Amino acid sequence: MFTGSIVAIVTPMDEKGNVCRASLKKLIDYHVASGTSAIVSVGTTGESATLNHDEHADVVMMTLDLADGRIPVIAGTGANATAEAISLTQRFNDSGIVGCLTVTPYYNRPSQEGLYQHFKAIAEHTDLPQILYNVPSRTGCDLLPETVGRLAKVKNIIGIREATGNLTRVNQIKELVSDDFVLLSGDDASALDFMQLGGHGVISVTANVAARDMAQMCKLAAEGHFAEARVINQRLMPLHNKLFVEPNPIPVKWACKELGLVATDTLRLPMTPITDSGRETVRAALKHAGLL
């Protein structure tokens, strides 16, 4: 399922930075019970950066196992080397995931033609649906609408997580692609505007801690009840902003720990523990949201 509220799930860790199965189970039961549409496993928020490919694969498999068919799982499969992205996709074929979330190469700043060839080749070597992921503030390159339009002609490239926060992109992309191509926000604070403009959902960081409210907001938006959805969005807005007061996923792991959804808020370097002031900011946002 590639519409509605999709959670970019944290990878919960013990004190030693190892994946905590018990916290993961809890998170997954929480999203099943709250009506989250799907789980994105080991994306940015899941600390893809600091897991090796074995741990990455382990987390995804464990996620599917715990999900036990109750919720669709999408694996983060992005890499800045095309051969690496291809190889990582192969690890997940026939695993039971329903699709892949695949980021524009970061750091090496390819041209639009190179992004085209990158994603074309990945899609070529799998039957799994591919969701493109554009986030220029992290990657240093910007996948423009024109190129999204080219890639949408490839059979199994089915959508895009658009994280520019630039809402003019929704209709620039939409007019170049077919009506079954999915447009998903990757910027929590502007996601409802994104959906009001034509977007079909959100791959969300906020959904980690406000799953029910996010699920309902996305359904209201899809039904066109934007004023109703906006009341919810207004109570989540401090969370939408303050979950990035410090680098994601530092605030969201702390929030998960504070709600008792995970055992520890541990991350791997270069991520560092939340500051006292950040705890204060985030706790205030959780309260504004009515979660505490």
Positions in the binding site for K ion (CB under 5 A):
157
Q: Contact 13/273 with Cβ under 8 angstroms?
A: no
**Closest separation in Å from C-beta 127 to K ion:** 6
Environment class of residue 267 by beta-carbon count within 10 Å: exposed (0-12), middle (13-18) or buried (19+)?
buried
- In this complex, which beta carbon is closest to K ion, that of residue 4 or of residue 129? 129
- Continuous H helices in the chain: 21-34, 53-67, 82-92, 112-124, 136-139, 145-151, 168-174, 191-196, 211-222, 226-242, 250-258, 276-288
Query: Does 107 sit near a copy of itself (CB under 8 A)?
Result: yes
Listed ranges 38-46, 110-118, 130-138, 222-230: which one lies at the site for Cl ion (CB under 5 A): 38-46
Query: Does 102 sit near a copy of itself (CB under 8 A)?
Result: no
Listed ranges 22-30, 42-50, 103-111, 127-135: which one lies at the site for Cl ion (CB under 5 A): 42-50
**Closest separation in Å from C-beta 69 to a copy of itself:** 32
Q: Which of 29, 58, 65, 84 binds a copy of itself (CB under 8 A)?
A: 84
Number of H helices, E strands in the chain: 12, 8
**Closest separation in Å from C-beta 173 to Cl ion:** 19
Query: Does 280 sit near a copy of itself (CB under 8 A)?
Result: no
- In this complex, which beta carbon is closest to Cl ion, that of residue 8 or of residue 261? 8
Element (H, E) at 41: strand 38-41
State the Cα–Cα distance between residues 168 and 203, nearest whole angstrom. Answer: 18
Q: Tally the C-alpha atoms within 13 A of residue 10's C-alpha that lie toward its C-beta.
A: 36
Positions touching Cl ion (CB under 5 A) are: 8, 43-45
Positions touching a copy of itself (CB under 8 A) are: 44, 47, 49-50, 52, 80-84, 105-111, 113-115, 117-118, 121, 137-140, 246-248, 250, 268-272
